[PDB]
């Protein structure tokens, strides 16, 4: 019975399909709609296509980056076993490529396939650093962060902007919209790091603090040598973790990431104000959206 | 710069390419050009596309059963870690799709997309029946094999009729030979592996012992009272050994191979008389065994 | 060394670590070094023996570099490796040469021979490590250290990725494998890596022969003893 075949493959993906993600990509899409003003028939499927990609990347991450739990409920890895979760994610992406090809075919979608292949180059750098111990630079961290999170918003804008409702010559609107998209994706990562360090993820990843500190001569040796024990033992200790947290509080680390966050906000608001003067009306959605990012 | 970031994605794929590939799918396609007679500039391209799909599938496979040594060299799982192998396998299959989405073909986008989704259903089942120990039946084993191995040759053929003078009164009589050839390999390939612990390594010569109506119920309970309490006992190691030897299941597999042939050599003949052109190539495939 | 670089059986006897315990061997070693400084000071103090102690402090900077790379996984350069080997092996030969001169003939100038002798010591000390490599790679040291072969390939774009990821599995798992080491040994023999050190050894000999001939004209006689040490390398 096909009802059984189609439901043993799709079974894992349904486990995180109904979790309360409380995402922001949906809220971001309906705010650009105030400008682009496209038919409602579209604005349904696009959320139903960008959501598939997000949940699929989540399955592949909670395996690559070995974690036991995420919030409350158990990880998709421990429930359905390792072998099935990978195949279920790999299959689900193929649906998303088809659901996109379904309608957009005129304007040359070869620029919507060229925007998915990069989302895997990004994580390849990430799994290469955490494994081979190579310390990052400063520009390399910002470049990697664009490849992984911000490129997903790039899909959303390039599909929204395909509906030139008897307007939008885009001659002056192509480049300008993209920088607005880029800045928010970069912001939505660093902002998570400041809330995260107010630990428990010292099992390999590379935050902004650690990359800023290891470039200040004081304690440069100490921090480098402590982290090496970690990847050798798989998790630091309950004691050694306290040492890095107190260094952060002394070299004034929790105050330099704050000083970078306030920089991107003034820049993006300037961009929106430049959009608000280019033959447009108020957009109280974007100007209320920034508050929902801590 | 950029060349650095580009060589980490393509590191595992370039490692499995250097293995000594068996090389059968690259000769079967060359034999069909006798009838269809497509240009060379495409035969080289279509071969490349099907090649990456099979190498990308296996990287997931040999990892889905953790084995430090597959043949000669170490396993990709034990050189590039595990997180790297999966995230490069995924990228590879998507890249193959993009090469089909171009001048390769214009209108039949749904045709090639659907034959790729199916390949994963026949592989999800394999993982299910392995993870729950629920041994299968012969009536469903043929389904899996045709949904997992044959679904590769099918794509190779459906794209070769899109370039080539005959008409649409032929394609119905070509898919039949494919599924027969695809099935016959898995059984013969498994046979070569044969000529104990289970852990999901099926074959025709193994699903037949658990269903031989003589001693069926007696065997079905020797396996249990076991795996969850200990590997085996000391007389059971001979018990499972001598039970399979008695009826010589290994010869019932011999009988089933001898039937596809007498159907096979009559399947080339049907097209052999449809198109007035001999085939010195289909006859040479049988030298494989 | 056989404690910091935890090793098994060496030449027929077990490592001094396992017999007397770890804590006891360290204290016995640190005591003997200070005992040797006192004998050195004793024989002479004129001509400034503040340069025989200033040249021992470096022998510990040398080993510190090696134990930091093997620990923190940082790949070496090629020029940087030559400095590490100079500090550790060559400096002991330098001590022996710097003490003989301080009391030899009390007549010879030596003014124009001080720099010349140091040039001879450096090349011989450097040579004895690169030549020692050939015997280790005909293995058992792929647990963190960096031979000359490994430094050449990881700087050649082909197969650089493969080996770098293989060795990383080691320091995380504590030892590579019995099979993967056969993989690493098989890579080396293909790109002719064990042939790039050979092409350096034949170069360094021509330098030593030229150097002694430059000394052989500076009021000196043949040395069938010095020229008998180099002959034992076929």
C76: left (phi over 0), alpha (psi -120 to 50) or beta: beta
**Which letter does DSSP use for residue A56 in this model?**
H
Approach to solving:
cryo-EM
Q: Cβ C180–B8 below 8 Å, yes or no?
A: no
Among residues A291, A286, A294, A226, which one has the least CA distance to residue A257? Answer: A294
Q: Cβ C165–B68 below 8 Å, yes or no?
A: no
Contact yes or no for A197/A207 (Cβ under 8 A): yes
Q: Read off φ and ψ for residue B73, nearest 5 degrees.
A: -95, 170
C-alpha distances out from residue B250 to B206, B207, B257, B289, Å = 9, 11, 12, 17
Interface residue ranges in chain B relative to chain C, Cβ cutoff 8 Å? 7-8, 11, 15, 68-69, 73-74, 78-81, 84
Residue of A6, A85, A90, A99 to mutate, testing the B interface (most B Cβ within 10 Å of its Cβ): A90
Tokens of C2: 């056989």
In this complex, the residue of C72, C164, C171 whose CB is nearest that of residue A225 is C72
B101, closest residue in chain A (CA to CA): A110
Among residues C151, C123, C127, C133, which one has the least CA distance to residue C214? Answer: C123
Contact yes or no for C131/C95 (Cβ under 8 A): no
Which residues from C are below 8 Å from A231, CB to CB?
Answer: 172
Among residues C92, C110, C97, which one has the least CA distance to residue C56? Answer: C92
**What Rg, from alpha-carbon coordinates, does chain A have?**
21
**What Rg, from alpha-carbon coordinates, does chain C have?**
21
In this complex, the residue of A81, A86, A127 whose CB is nearest that of residue B84 is A127
Q: Cβ A133–C165 below 8 Å, yes or no?
A: no
CA distance A149 to A187: 10
Among residues A173, A181, A176, which one has the least CA distance to residue A156? Answer: A181
The CA dihedral of B186, B187, B188, B189, to the nearest 10 degrees, is: 40
Q: Cβ B87–A120 below 8 Å, yes or no?
A: yes
Experimental structure resolution, Å: 3.7
Tokens of B160: 């070769």
Among residues A89, A10, A95, A61, which one has the least CA distance to residue B128? Answer: A10
Contact yes or no for A97/B97 (Cβ under 8 A): yes
In this complex, the residue of B69, B79, B81 whose CB is nearest that of residue C162 is B79
C71, closest residue in chain A (CA to CA): A228
Which residues from A are below 8 Å from B90, CB to CB?
Answer: 60, 89-90, 93, 120
List residues forming the annotated binding site of C for Mg(2+). Answer: 1, 5
Distance between A246 CA and the closest CA of chain B, angstroms: 32
CA distance B16 to B26: 17
A74: left (phi over 0), alpha (psi -120 to 50) or beta: beta
Tokens of A64: 């690559």
Query: What is the Cβ-side half-sphere exposure of residue C176, based on CA atoms within 13 angstroms?
Result: 23
Q: Cβ B74–C179 below 8 Å, yes or no?
A: yes
Among residues B208, B289, B192, which one has the least CA distance to residue B251? Answer: B208
CA distance C73 to C56: 27
The CA dihedral of B153, B22, C185, B77, to the nearest 10 degrees, is: 30
DSSP element (H, E) containing A74: strand A73-74
**Opening angle at CA A286, ends A285 and A289, nearest 5:** 85
Contact yes or no for A100/A48 (Cβ under 8 A): no
B130-135's contacts with Cβ under 8 Å and 24+ in sequence apart are: B130/A83, B130/B199, B130/B200, B131/A81, B131/A83, B131/A84, B133/B198, B133/B227, B135/B207, B135/B210
A126, closest residue in chain B (CA to CA): B84
Contact yes or no for C187/C156 (Cβ under 8 A): no
Among residues B259, B269, B262, which one has the least CA distance to residue B173? Answer: B269
Tokens of C104: 């030899």
CA distance B191 to B175: 24
Where do we find the tokens 């070769």?
B160
**Opening angle at CA C170, ends C165 and C171, nearest 5:** 105
Q: Which residues pair with B73 in a beta bridge?
A: B71
Residues in chain A, total? 294
Distance of CA A202 to the CA centre of its chain: 20
For C147-212, the DSSP string reads: -HHHHHHTTSSTTHHHHHHHHHHHHHHTS--SSHHHHHHHHHTTTT-TTTTHHHHHHHHHHHHHHH
CA distance C48 to A199: 55
């Amino acid at each position: 019975h096909i009802f059984f075949e189609k439901a043993v493959l799709e079974a894992p993906y349904d486990y995180i399909a109904s979790m309360p993600s409380k995402g922001v990509r949906d809220q971001f899409i309906d705010a650009l709609n105030d400008w682009l003003r496209v038919p409602d028939v579209k604005v349904g499927k696009i959320k139903d296509a960008v959501r598939v990609l997000h949940n699929s990347s989540l399955l592949l991450d909670d395996f690559q980056d070995n974690s036991p739990l995420r919030r409350g409920k158990p990880s998709t890895h421990n429930i359905f076993g390792s072998a099935q979760t990978v195949n279920t994610a790999t299959y689900s992406i193929i649906k998303a490529i088809g659901q996109i090809m379904e309608f957009s075919a005129g304007e040359s979608v070869q620029e919507v396939m060229n925007s998915i292949m990069i989302l895997f180059q990004g994580q390849a750098m990430d799994l290469f650093w955490t494994y081979n111990g190579h310390v990052p630079s400063e520009e390399e961290y910002y470049r990697m962060i664009d490849q992984k999170t911000g490129q997903l918003f790039s899909i959303a804008t390039s599909l929204l902007l395909n509906a030139a409702d008897n307007e939008i010559p885009r001659t002056k609107i192509q480049s300008c919209l993209h920088r607005l998209t880029r800045l928010l994706g970069r912001c939505f990562q660093i902002c998570d790091d400041y809330q995260n360090l107010v630990e428990d993820l010292d099992e390999g990843k590379w935050s902004l603090a650690l990359i800023h500190m290891i470039h200040k001569q004081r304690s440069h040796m100490a921090l480098l040598n402590v982290l090496s024990t970690g990847r050798k033992h798989g998790g630091m200790t309950l004691e050694q973790k306290q040492f890095v947290l107190d260094i952060i509080e002394e070299e004034k680390s929790l105050d330099y990431t704050r000083s970078v966050m306030m920089d991107l906000h003034v820049q993006l608001r300037a961009e929106i104000g430049r959009i608000e003067i280019l033959l447009d009306s108020p957009n109280p959605a974007m100007r209320l959206l920034l508050e929902l990012l801590r």
